[PDB]
Write a protein that binds this ligand. Sequence first.
Ligand code: GNP
Ligand code: GNP
Ligand code: GNP
Ligand code: GNP
Ligand code: MG
Ligand code: MG
Ligand code: MG
Ligand code: MG
Lengths: 171, 171, 171, 171
Amino acid sequence: YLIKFLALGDSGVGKTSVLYQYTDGKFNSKFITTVGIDFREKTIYRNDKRIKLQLWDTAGLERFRSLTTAFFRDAMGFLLLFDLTNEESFLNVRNWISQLKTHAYSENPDIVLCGNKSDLEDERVVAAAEARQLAEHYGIPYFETSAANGTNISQAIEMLLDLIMKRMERS
Amino acid sequence: YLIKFLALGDSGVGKTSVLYQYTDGKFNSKFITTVGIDFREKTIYRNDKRIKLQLWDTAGLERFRSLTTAFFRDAMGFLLLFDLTNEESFLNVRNWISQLKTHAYSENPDIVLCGNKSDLEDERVVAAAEARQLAEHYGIPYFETSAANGTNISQAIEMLLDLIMKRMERS
Amino acid sequence: YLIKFLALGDSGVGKTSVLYQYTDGKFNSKFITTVGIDFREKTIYRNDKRIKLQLWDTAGLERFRSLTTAFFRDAMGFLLLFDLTNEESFLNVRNWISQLKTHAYSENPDIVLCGNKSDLEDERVVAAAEARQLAEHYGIPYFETSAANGTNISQAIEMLLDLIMKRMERS
Amino acid sequence: YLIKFLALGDSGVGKTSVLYQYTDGKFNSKFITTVGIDFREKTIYRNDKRIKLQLWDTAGLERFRSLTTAFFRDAMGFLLLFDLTNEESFLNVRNWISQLKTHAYSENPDIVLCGNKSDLEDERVVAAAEARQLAEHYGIPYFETSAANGTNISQAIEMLLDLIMKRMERS
Ligand SMILES: Nc1nc2c(ncn2[C@@H]2O[C@H](COP(=O)(O)OP(=O)(O)NP(=O)(O)O)[C@@H](O)[C@H]2O)c(=O)[nH]1
Ligand SMILES: Nc1nc2c(ncn2[C@@H]2O[C@H](COP(=O)(O)OP(=O)(O)NP(=O)(O)O)[C@@H](O)[C@H]2O)c(=O)[nH]1
Ligand SMILES: Nc1nc2c(ncn2[C@@H]2O[C@H](COP(=O)(O)OP(=O)(O)NP(=O)(O)O)[C@@H](O)[C@H]2O)c(=O)[nH]1
Ligand SMILES: Nc1nc2c(ncn2[C@@H]2O[C@H](COP(=O)(O)OP(=O)(O)NP(=O)(O)O)[C@@H](O)[C@H]2O)c(=O)[nH]1
Ligand SMILES: [Mg+2]
Ligand SMILES: [Mg+2]
Ligand SMILES: [Mg+2]
Ligand SMILES: [Mg+2]
């Protein structure tokens, strides 16, 4: 009931800003383009249970992440993000979901897709339906998040917790 | 009938621009000198068959590529490029073809050499015969490509597909 | 009686400046933000014995340190530092002490926490009690060090030497 | 009778300029501070034999070199350089020779120490005797080299060839 999952996606998505909105309920706009392999942890109570939630952050400038073979290997669920203000990030989601399924333990591992930076209404480039459709072909939940607003952040992470808690219970 | 091969060579050759000309039939002149380990995938029909072609790109600033021991190890053919406007790139091809043969699975693995940036007629430095000769000593196909024009791009990749499809069939 | 330990913590703490104050008894204010994996060595006489002390320095821009699986794996004690003039460094100590216990050999390995840059009285941000309290919850020694002054440097390293010498003797 | 050795030392020593003086008998003053893991090869005739000499270059900004566990592991001799115009480089030689002996195959592996940049007479900082003394305590050959002049370059590499050829013959 230590629960570990991994946040991943492209550089600029906002997976550092997103974990901090959840862990600490506020928004640091300052963030070095991550070089290392950090994590924030925090105790949650969901289904009247003990959850030491361990939120592992990754460097956006590699898919060598999930080649960690311990950090990725030890993780139980994945939180794939993209930026709703660059298409490139969104288009890679297929390649991400793909490489997860292959290099992961289970054939179908527990994933939640977030389209971040939703507050940037004026720079939106990914259309919501197309996103929802991509969520359909894979049958994984989708949330339009903002680490600036907090919109759907808690929902999104709580879903991933609920998914793997189900997986844990099914066993 | 998922087919994986790896594009490699020196930094500036144009192996990112070349995969995008093939995948998407156009030319992005913008490309950050690759830091990560990306790939584009795409479904092709060659010999009335299902081809999920997986085009793996590498960072030009290492031969630590092919030390990937999974990414290189899992790949079935190699697409070695050089720039026809710097000799250094061309001269390394021997050292590349060399280190492939050694660190690869088969004694003779399936390779296609491309001399890229052929549109840069005014800055050409490698002479075509010398290139063809180098292709001779190793008995691997050679194409003078441009990611700007698309010239010989499709031909070149289709050849590499045809080679490993032959290898697959021979087994 | 070659003794190896590893200095680690965040970028800017002063673990390069601290090893040099100890090895060489003076202060180089010049220090490139470490890119490699250096060490200083030096022969010491503690409990009337031969000590080839090997002081391994790490790059502050990773927890991929302690994933070294030889450099970290071969080390016998750890010297965790933080800067008393940025809270972030101090707050990570928990996450450091945590990840050490997990990825290390022994359940409880030999650690000494240093709060560096104590000379920067005017920019002090971590309160001494809170630091001492953090040392309490884990039961590991704590020193307020300066690589500029030398204050508590020798004490701190000599303690870590004494701890693992005890561990060696107990075996 | 493929012979592999590895050139290593600190960033700025001149181990890229030195291999090129040997391979090609001239001096490129232009050299990006190496990021990757290159090698030059060349066929030599020493003791009336076939030598495919493989000269592996390393990035100066790590001792993670010799952690390559294939590139270092596959190498048969080592060519340690330092700059005669910075003491730091020279002082590390002990730590280099040390870490070689430990992480290498044989207890005493085949090493040749070069003090490079000897042409920079006006900026010389390491005194020749002190260098020769350091060579004495370890009993490995020493040459004062210049990649600018070619002075002692061929001698130095030919010695390392002769050493490991002896080791090969003794077996
Ligand atoms: N306005 C706004 N900016 C955001 C949002 N999420 C992230 N950012 C901003 O996007 C930039 C990078 O986000 P960051 O938190 O570094 O994301 P990351 O995906 O962890 N970066 P990397 O992949 O390089 O490690 C910063 O400028 C950050 O403030 C968001 O929802 N809204
Ligand atoms: N004119 C022209 N420019 C080209 C061609 N191919 C690549 N380029 C240009 O060459 C530069 C580098 O191309 P790029 O694809 O990044 O090369 P790379 O070898 O993939 N780089 P890296 O190894 O770092 O991944 C870019 O400015 C790109 O437009 C070509 O056929 N013609
Ligand atoms: N005033 C003061 N400056 C210090 C002290 N210790 C380190 N510094 C300064 O802190 C800066 C970085 O210190 P350094 O030793 O390089 O830090 P590091 O923890 O080794 N960094 P990295 O993790 O990037 O290798 C340098 O400017 C150095 O002078 C100290 O005790 N007092
Ligand atoms: N005058 C002079 N300059 C030299 C000599 N050897 C190398 N240099 C110069 O020193 C600089 C760096 O040398 P280089 O060969 O790149 O060394 P390196 O050790 O491979 N560097 P890295 O560790 O970053 O890979 C360049 O300006 C090069 O021209 C020499 O004998 N004399
Ligand atoms: Mg980040
Ligand atoms: Mg590229
Ligand atoms: Mg440092
Ligand atoms: Mg170099």
